[PDB]
Design a protein that fits this description.
mainly beta; hydrolase; Cathepsin D, subunit A, domain 1; fragment screening; 330 residues
Amino acid sequence: STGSATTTPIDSLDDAYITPVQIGTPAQTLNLDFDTGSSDLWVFSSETTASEVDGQTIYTPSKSTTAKLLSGATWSISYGDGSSSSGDVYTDTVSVGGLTVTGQAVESAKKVSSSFTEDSTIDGLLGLAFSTLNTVSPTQQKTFFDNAKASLDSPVFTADLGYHAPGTYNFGFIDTTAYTGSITYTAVSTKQGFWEWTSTGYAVGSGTFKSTSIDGIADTGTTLLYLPATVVSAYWAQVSGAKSSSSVGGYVFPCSATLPSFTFGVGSARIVIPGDYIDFGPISTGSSSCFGGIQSSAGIGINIFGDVALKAAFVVFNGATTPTLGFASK
C-alpha cells in the first residue's frame, strides 16, 4: 500500500502545516500537524475541556462505530516550545491520503495549553518520530507510520513542504518527479527517539562552505531552523542592522533588508535555503523590525532542522531496519 496527502500552511508565514486525516467510521476528518519530532497522535475531541476549544474540529469517539476505549490508558506530553496536552486513549481506524491503519491509538485530549487553544487551524498532532517517545501509559503505543510500515510498498515516508504553498506527505513510495537531481542519504541515530543526523557544514549567501559537523533533528513540527550560536551569528552578521533581541526572543532584522541564502551540507551534497524563506515578518503588526527564521539552539539542547530548512528540500524518512534520511533539491 501507499498514501499521499496534501499538506497546507496554516497562515501566510508557514508557521505550521496541516494535513487532513480521516478518523473513525463514518470518517471524521481532522486537520493534523504532522510532527517528525514527536510520537503521539492526539486530537481535540468531545472530551476536551470546553473553554480550551476555540474553533477546532473535534473527534467524537461515541459517533464512531470502530472506536474502542483503550482501558486504563492515559497520555501527557510537553513540547519543546513549552506547549502541552493530555487525556485518554481510543483505538480507531485512521486513514491518511488513502492509506488506512486499523487499531491506531488516537489520543483524545482532555486538556490542552493555551497555544493549542489559540490556534483554531490545528485539530491535533500526528507524530512521526520513533515510537519509543510515545507518551501513552501504562502501555506505550505505536505511531501511524510504525503501524502502517509492514503494509507499505517501501518502509518510508517523504516530506515535501511548500514555501508559502501546499506540499505533500507520501507514505510507502518515493515520487521521483518531485525532486531534481539525486537524493543524498545520510545516517540516522535513533538514540534520542528523533530523526537525528549530522550535517556536514554550511554557507552564508555566496560565501565559502564551512566544513563542520552539525548534529540535529529533522523536525517538521518546528517552524524555524535552530543552529549553534556561532553559525547563527555568522549568518546574521551578513544582514545590516540585524541583532539578537532578548526582549523579542531571538534575532530580528530590518524589514527593508534583502536576506542572504543559507546552505547546509548533506554528505557531499548541498541544500540551499533562499533568503526569503528566512523572513518571518514584522515582530508585531506594523513594525519595521522583522523576525528571523534562523535562530540559536543554545539552551534548547539540540539543533533543529525545522520547516525553514526542510521546505527547501524533498526529504525521505527511511524507516528500514537501519533508518536513514534522504535530501534532494527540488
